[PDB]
Design a protein around this ligand. Structure first.
Ligand SMILES: Nc1ncnc2c1ncn2[C@@H]1O[C@H](COP(=O)(O)OP(=O)(O)O)[C@@H](O)[C@H]1O
Ligand SMILES: Nc1ncnc2c1ncn2[C@@H]1O[C@H](COP(=O)(O)OP(=O)(O)O)[C@@H](O)[C@H]1O
Length: 203
């Protein structure tokens, strides 16, 4: 099974992807996590992607498409989490899969209002070492666990990221709807409730 998680930043896509991958045996492909590792290591990809990420812009398509070609699991179930982010990327994904006799089985759209998005992101805190994600209100980190607020989770960059999502990424909703594989998730609900719906639509 191949899944794509789609939705505004802060919808809880990474949270649900980690849970589902761990519990039901999927390989989790997070372009965000992979890019952040590239940046930390200072690879050619990391050094180029960094400035786009910092401004809240998308990293150029060719770089992301090559990344996916490099890391795509040959066998097994896969959750694509944060990819594709543009129509060009979605078309590239379809081509790659078609050549391998595969396809995207379900696209899950994590619906959540803008006001909730902003609250999700402004309260997001991460363990900079482990990448573990917390929220100051809805899932506070234990004391004596070092966390930070990511620079791209500050108000100005959040605004930019939502604009970029609406302009470049939201068209994928219609792209996948017309393939007949789109499923709607109410991602505004608490974590366990969202996870139950995730399990429902793929069962
Ligand atoms: N598929 C992609 N195409 C272009 N840029 C990406 C992609 N995935 C991640 N990025 C870059 O990494 C940043 C953070 O990505 P991600 O971790 O998926 O988002 P979020 O902050 O919503 O959890 C994005 O704002 C973008 O700059
Ligand atoms: N259902 C939920 N209710 C409240 N907070 C959530 C929920 N899901 C995730 N979060 C928190 O919201 C923020 C965004 O979650 P994340 O998984 O990083 O979103 P995305 O990957 O879609 O950008 C994180 O701080 C996370 O702890």
């Amino acid at each position: 099974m191949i899944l794509v998680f789609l939705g505004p930043p802060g919808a809880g896509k990474g949270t649900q992807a980690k849970r589902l991958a761990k519990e039901k045996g999927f390989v989790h492909i997070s372009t965000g996590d992979i890019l952040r590792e590239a940046v930390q290591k200072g690879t050619p990809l990391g050094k180029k992607a960094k400035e786009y990420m910092e401004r809240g812009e998308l990293v150029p398509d060719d770089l992301i498409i090559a990344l996916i070609e490099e890391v795509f699991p040959k066998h097994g179930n896969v959750i694509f989490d944060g990819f594709p982010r543009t129509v060009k990327q979605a078309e590239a994904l379809d081509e790659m899969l078609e050549k391998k006799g595969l396809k995207v089985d379900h696209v899950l759209l994590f619906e959540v209002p803008d006001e909730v998005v902003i609250e999700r992101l402004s309260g997001r805190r991460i363990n900079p070492e482990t990448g573990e994600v917390y929220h100051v209100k809805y899932n506070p980190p234990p004391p004596g666990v070092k966390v930070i607020q990511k620079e791209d989770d500050k108000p100005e960059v959040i605004k930019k990221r939502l604009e970029v999502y609406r302009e470049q990424t939201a068209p994928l909703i219609e792209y996948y709807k017309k393939k007949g594989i789109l499923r709607i998730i109410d991602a505004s609900k608490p974590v366990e409730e969202v996870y139950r719906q995730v399990l429902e639509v793929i069962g």
